[PDB]
Amino acid sequence: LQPFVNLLSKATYWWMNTLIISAHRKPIDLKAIGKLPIAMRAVTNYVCLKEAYEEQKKKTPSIWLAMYRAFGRPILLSSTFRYLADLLGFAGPLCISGIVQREFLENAHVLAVLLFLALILQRTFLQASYYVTIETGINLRGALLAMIYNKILRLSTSNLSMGEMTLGQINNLVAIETNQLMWFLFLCPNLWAMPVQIIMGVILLYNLLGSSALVGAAVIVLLAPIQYFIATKLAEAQKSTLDYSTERLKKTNEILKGIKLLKLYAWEHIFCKSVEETRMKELSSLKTFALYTSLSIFMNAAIPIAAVLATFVTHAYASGNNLKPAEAFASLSLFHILVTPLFLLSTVVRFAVKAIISVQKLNEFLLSDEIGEDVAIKVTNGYFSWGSGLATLSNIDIRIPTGQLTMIVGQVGCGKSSLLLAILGEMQTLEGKVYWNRYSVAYAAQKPWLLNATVEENITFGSSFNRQRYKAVTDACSLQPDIDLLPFGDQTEIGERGINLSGGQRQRICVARALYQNTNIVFLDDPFSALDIHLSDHLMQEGILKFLQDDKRTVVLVTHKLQYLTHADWIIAMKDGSVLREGTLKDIQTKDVELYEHWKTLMNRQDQELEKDMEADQTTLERKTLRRAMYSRVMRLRTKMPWKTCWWYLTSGGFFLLFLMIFSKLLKHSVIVAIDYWLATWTSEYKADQTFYVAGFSILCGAGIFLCLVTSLTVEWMGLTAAKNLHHNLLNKIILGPIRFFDTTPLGLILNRFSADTNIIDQHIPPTLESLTRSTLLCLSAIGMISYATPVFLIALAPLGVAFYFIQKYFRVASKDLQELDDSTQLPLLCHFSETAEGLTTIRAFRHETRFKQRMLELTDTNNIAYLFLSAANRWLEVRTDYLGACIVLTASIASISGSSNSGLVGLGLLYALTITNYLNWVVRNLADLEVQMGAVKKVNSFLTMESENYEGTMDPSQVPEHWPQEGEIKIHDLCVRYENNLKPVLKHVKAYIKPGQKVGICGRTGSGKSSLSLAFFRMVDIFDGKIVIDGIDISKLPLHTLRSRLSIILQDPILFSGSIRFNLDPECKCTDDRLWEALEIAQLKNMVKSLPGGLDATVTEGGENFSVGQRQLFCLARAFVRKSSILIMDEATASIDMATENILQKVVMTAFADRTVVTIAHRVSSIMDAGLVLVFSEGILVECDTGPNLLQHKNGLFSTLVM
């Protein structure tokens, strides 16, 4: 009995049962799920698929043949199960005909029991086929991901091969093409099962109804081309909507990062309107998409009705016999059977075409350019090239002594990085040989590569953690001062996803990773490129010379700092892809005196140039940015369906639309039941005159078609209205919020609310709601009609319904976990592939390909097990609801046979009992989908219920003059500034009198509250005591727009917004082009604008990447001059700016802004030694407020110490 119970457990998915039941007790996690079986692990499937692919390559290789030879037998098994289920599905109409007709097989109860058994077997076989094909598709996805990851690990990094689009193509293959191929393998048995089922259904219809059934067969067969055409139009409209949504999301992201500047300039509403224009275009495209969706729904619901109408009218007239209940309702059952394959065969064909495209892309990727197969390293007569045939490195003959520092020196473009990568084997070897006396190399690439992991996980890089070595490595690279600034320290997730670091910090972290590894050979490729003199010298003295010589490492150091050549044991001088001369410094000097003299001249010139420029500190400005970035730093609910969120979404389109949808759907399903009952009455008159019944049937069918159209239009109209209203409210609501909200909430969360939740509301919810309402109404009408035919069925409705409740309860939570789990596993795996595409040279130099292969296999196995268990929960639910439906069919059949009203009613009840089995599962599935989507609607509403700023001022706008800050007086009385309630005040008792047209310089130590004062000028920070009176008007008693739009501010990092230069200068477009040209000339920028095509309407890239940072700062100066505020705030504007551009900025401020009151937070204190009023801040307290010379003459003063 053990094999029998094992087979039953497999067939009913009983092994999921416990995992479902536990979902109420505790959330489902990866620990609750087991591991993948050996036959299901990605490694075994990868080996099978790779063996098949290599067999094909032996013989151009066929991916399709490899997939068939690897994962073909399970497809044949699932096809056998699908054919058995299709055959056992036609027992429905046959048993309906037999029962309605009323030796042994003639018995009606025998036929009812046989129909029950046939339904149970059919559903078991169908779910088995679904599970087998889904498992095979998941195995194929794992194998394909492993194959493409190995191909990635083999990829060549040359610019000819590894282009800028290669990483995007890899991401597309991992995230899209592999999933398209997996879904095609999911749906492939349909491709040869649906045609057979359709042909057999048409044959059964013909056997039932003569040639009259061929008319309905043709009409309903017309549904497949119509659905294919409608799906083509849907794809086109979806691409259009996706383009418009991408533009809208680009604009929204540009607003969100940079919202502080927009609020300071009071340009938030202009950018909101700019986003709303793109939103309106996207909404028009979405309207076309919804129109085609409603067409699809209407056709799916109306072609069957027209086919039934044509069939039965043609039978009433052409056929000489009366319509019989058995034939009529068996044919109705056959039509209902045929609807689904005809509607979904177009989907299967579309997936087949997309799979052909995906296999073409995958096969074109699997055929890509890939890398080829004392003294530690020696190159003899080496001729290397980057794949173009032209040798980049010609006649390379070098020697790298073991355990000695080797420095490669040459001008930019010599081929030093090329020499290192040719030694590592990353480029083609035309001639020569590289001898290693390969081996693992600690490689620090010229472009630093960071994993999306913590600082410690980047530095250790798959190596055992040693605290002494880790501390020594961190000290040598001077990483502790900037690690301490990180929120979590070593455990701070850095990289693309995590905290953004400066180029110098990333370079030092990669150098630390190179130093930490205990490999005898270290390759450093310009490690001082993004560092300053002090950090470079410390790394050279402690890391290269001390730490790397304690371990006796063979160090190869590509550098431009020739001053370090005195520390070199071996020197390799390059020029134009060839070595001029190699050897010790003394040997080079003796043999090649000219090269030594040239090196001396270069060292002297570099020292002379750096002597003046050493004043600027790169590391100080990196650490200040990193420190400023950190200034800001349920069981009952699990099963609670969000009915309030559902009601809010339904009423967000208006009560008329909701009423129209509900009324139209109720009327449509009433009419459908009416046509079924009319057929019942017509057949129960069984040649009489058919005119009355034909006329009534035609009228009912026409009304049903019209109501199908009405409901299809109405649900999509409601969805469009709700989406429009929700997004329109959301954008404006979040923009008006305080700056503290944007400082606290990450940009990722807000952008998710604007992209993913918006897409869910726009395109996912309307179809889910339509399907849920349709399935629920079909089930309710079926139950009502079965109970009307036989009231005793209601007795069995109490148990079965109760069962249904539990079946819908547990599933609705279990899947909710599994889906989430699936998502939590999709993000890492994809990221892994990206981390391997960029950083491939580092991985292959460290020789850590095996570790990354293992990590990829783990990630894909986790993703596959999550997806498999989600699908298994779906199969569990389908089996449960299918057995419920079989019980319903058996009960209805027995009740109808025992107590018969008439033959037509028996047939009608049997048909409805048979049909409810299809929709019971979809009621639960759509309810779960609706709950998931209402989660996103709840997120959007939560963002919509946030608190905004107080944009309405106390003062009467008539009281405020037209030119309010005309003079520029400022009076700060007992100012107490905090960034949020319950936090400590950041400014305490600041009192100052800024004379109109007086140049004020604000200075102090880091964290003293200088930027907080500039924010208090704009009321971007919470003032709770004291006041700021600007030109006689308290700014607290003022609208925020009037205050912020009449004051000019210049921040440190300049930000320009995508659009025209005229748009950047004034989005409001109040000024004239002559004024804009005058401002551009003032900012010493008119010639640059003239050089650009179009002048004032030259396109600015997002962030202003077209212009240099100095040009961006000059643009900010031009905007400030356009504003004509007479009060200009400059928050360390000259920082991160070239010295020449800094002098230009100072000249512009002195000349053009001579009249305006300039309040400058000096980046360099010496710049405000001659300022009229100097405000010195210490720890939030105004220590000194006097003239510059007055503070200078007072010895031992804070300003005097700052100046020195």
Ligand X SMILES: Nc1ncnc2c1ncn2[C@@H]1O[C@H](COP(=O)(O)OP(=O)(O)OP(=O)(O)O)[C@@H](O)[C@H]1O
- Taking CB under 5 A as the binding criterion, the range among 52-60, 439-447, 683-691, 937-945 that sits at the site for Mg ion is 439-447
Number of Cβ within 10 Å of residue 669's Cβ equals 21
Tell me: does residue 1011 bind ligand BJX (CB under 6 A): no
Contacts to ligand BJX from residues 311-340, by CB under 6 A:
340
- Taking CB under 6 A as the binding criterion, the range among 205-213, 242-250, 1007-1015, 1068-1076 that sits at the site for ligand X is 1007-1015
Tell me: does residue 871 bind ligand BJX (CB under 6 A): yes
Torsions phi, psi for 819 (to 5 deg): -50, -50
Tell me: does residue 580 bind ligand BJX (CB under 6 A): no
By the 10 Å C-beta count (0-12 exposed, 13-18 middle, 19+ buried), 372 is classed as: exposed
347 binds, among ligand BJX, Mg ion, ligand X, none (CB under 5 to 8 A by kind): ligand BJX
Find out whether 193 and 87 touch, Cβ atoms under 8 Å: no
DSSP string, 181-201: HHHHHHHHHHHHHHHHHHHHH
Find out whether 1012 and 987 touch, Cβ atoms under 8 Å: yes
- Taking CB under 6 A as the binding criterion, the range among 107-115, 136-144, 622-630, 1096-1104 that sits at the site for ligand X is 622-630
Nearest Cα residue to 559 out of 523, 517, 584: 523
Separation of alpha carbons 452 and 493, rounded Å? 7
Separation of alpha carbons 1103 and 1054, rounded Å? 9
Among 631, 659, 692, 806, binds ligand X (CB under 6 A): 631
- Taking CB under 5 A as the binding criterion, the range among 178-186, 416-424, 456-464, 974-982 that sits at the site for Mg ion is 416-424
CB of 449 to ligand BJX, least distance (A): 36
CB of 361 to ligand X, least distance (A): 24
Among 519, 714, 842, 1011, binds Mg ion (CB under 5 A): 1011
Residues in the chain: 1204
Cβ proximity to Mg ion: between 715 and 1002 the closer is: 1002
Binding mask 738-777 vs ligand X (x if CB under 6 A, - otherwise)?
Answer: -----x----------------------------------
Separation of alpha carbons 528 and 540, rounded Å? 9
Amino acid making up residue 1034: D
Among 127, 684, 1011, 1084, binds ligand X (CB under 6 A): 1011
Residue 1182: strand, helix, or coil = strand
- Provide the phi-psi class of 64: left if phi over 0, else alpha when psi is between -120 and 50, else beta: alpha
Among 281, 628, 989, 1086, binds ligand X (CB under 6 A): 628
287 binds, among ligand X, ligand BJX, Mg ion, none (CB under 5 to 8 A by kind): none
Find out whether 1060 and 1106 touch, Cβ atoms under 8 Å: no
Residue 148 in tokens: 């493409």
Tell me: does residue 461 bind ligand BJX (CB under 6 A): no
Cβ proximity to Mg ion: between 67 and 408 the closer is: 408
By the 10 Å C-beta count (0-12 exposed, 13-18 middle, 19+ buried), 1074 is classed as: exposed
Residue 446: strand, helix, or coil = coil
Beta-carbon contacts of 543 under 8 Å, excluding residues fewer than 6 positions away, are 473, 476, 477, 511, 515
- The β-bridge partners of 949 are none
CB of 629 to ligand X, least distance (A): 10
- Taking CB under 5 A as the binding criterion, the range among 3-11, 870-878, 1007-1015, 1147-1155 that sits at the site for Mg ion is 1007-1015
In Å, what is the CA distance from 1130 to each residue of 860, 1047, 1051, 1153?
A: 52, 11, 6, 12
Binding mask 403-432 vs ligand X (x if CB under 6 A, - otherwise)?
Answer: -------x-xxxxxxx--------------
943 binds, among ligand BJX, ligand X, Mg ion, none (CB under 5 to 8 A by kind): none
Binding mask 963-1002 vs ligand X (x if CB under 6 A, - otherwise)?
Answer: ----------------x------x----------------
Residue 1108: strand, helix, or coil = coil
Tell me: does residue 1008 bind ligand X (CB under 6 A): yes
Binding mask 427-456 vs ligand X (x if CB under 6 A, - otherwise)?
Answer: -------------------x----------
CB of 529 to ligand X, least distance (A): 8
Nearest Cα residue to 439 out of 553, 540, 544: 553
Binding mask 699-738 vs ligand X (x if CB under 6 A, - otherwise)?
Answer: ----------------------------------------
Beta-carbon contacts of 509 under 8 Å, excluding residues fewer than 6 positions away, are 448, 450, 455, 458, 459, 477, 479, 494, 501
CB of 770 to ligand X, least distance (A): 46
102 binds, among ligand X, Mg ion, ligand BJX, none (CB under 5 to 8 A by kind): none
Q: Tell the residue number behind the tokens 């604000």, with chain if given.
A: 1002
In Å, what is the CA distance from 1000 to each residue of 99, 1029, 1127, 1156, 1202?
A: 98, 16, 11, 11, 17
Residue 90 in tokens: 């036609």
Torsions phi, psi for 561 (to 5 deg): -80, 90
Tell me: does residue 49 bind ligand BJX (CB under 6 A): no
Tell me: does residue 503 bind ligand X (CB under 6 A): no
Number of Cβ within 10 Å of residue 94's Cβ equals 19
- Cα angle for residues 183, 185, 187 (degrees, 5° grid): 70
Cβ proximity to Mg ion: between 446 and 1036 the closer is: 446
CB of 393 to Mg ion, least distance (A): 13
Helix (H) or strand (E) holding 1069: none
Tell me: does residue 13 bind ligand X (CB under 6 A): no
Residue 701 in tokens: 């069918």
Beta-carbon contacts of 1055 under 8 Å, excluding residues fewer than 6 positions away, are 258, 261, 1103, 1104, 1112
- Taking CB under 6 A as the binding criterion, the range among 75-83, 727-735, 802-810, 1004-1012 that sits at the site for ligand X is 1004-1012
190 binds, among ligand BJX, ligand X, Mg ion, none (CB under 5 to 8 A by kind): ligand BJX
Tell me: does residue 1009 bind ligand X (CB under 6 A): yes
Separation of alpha carbons 880 and 874, rounded Å? 10
- The β-bridge partners of 383 are 431
Among 446, 492, 529, 1036, binds Mg ion (CB under 5 A): 446
Cβ proximity to ligand X: between 159 and 601 the closer is: 159
Tell me: does residue 1160 bind Mg ion (CB under 5 A): no
Tell me: does residue 417 bind Mg ion (CB under 5 A): yes
Contacts to ligand BJX from residues 338-377, by CB under 6 A:
340, 344, 347-348
Find out whether 303 and 225 touch, Cβ atoms under 8 Å: no
Residue 1201 in tokens: 């110490």
Residue 583: strand, helix, or coil = strand
Contacts to ligand X from residues 337-396, by CB under 6 A:
386, 392
CA atoms within 13 A on the CB side of 198: 21
Tell me: does residue 874 bind ligand BJX (CB under 6 A): yes
Please enumerate, by residue number, every residue annotated as part of a binding site for ATP. 410-417, 1004-1011
The size of the interface with ligand X (CB under 6 A), counted in residues, is 29
CB of 602 to Mg ion, least distance (A): 17
Among 96, 100, 134, 421, binds ligand BJX (CB under 6 A): 134
Binding mask 821-860 vs ligand BJX (x if CB under 6 A, - otherwise)?
Answer: ----------------------------------------
DSSP string, 424-438: TT-SEEEEEEEEE--
Beta-carbon contacts of 1105 under 8 Å, excluding residues fewer than 6 positions away, are none
Among 124, 190, 227, 926, binds ligand BJX (CB under 6 A): 190
| Residues lying near Mg ion in the complex (CB under 5 A) | 417, 446, 1011
| Residues lying near ligand BJX in the complex (CB under 6 A) | 130, 133-134, 186-187, 190, 340, 344, 347-348, 871, 874
| Residues lying near ligand X in the complex (CB under 6 A) | 157-159, 386, 392, 410, 412-418, 446, 624, 627-628, 631-632, 743, 979, 986, 1006-1012
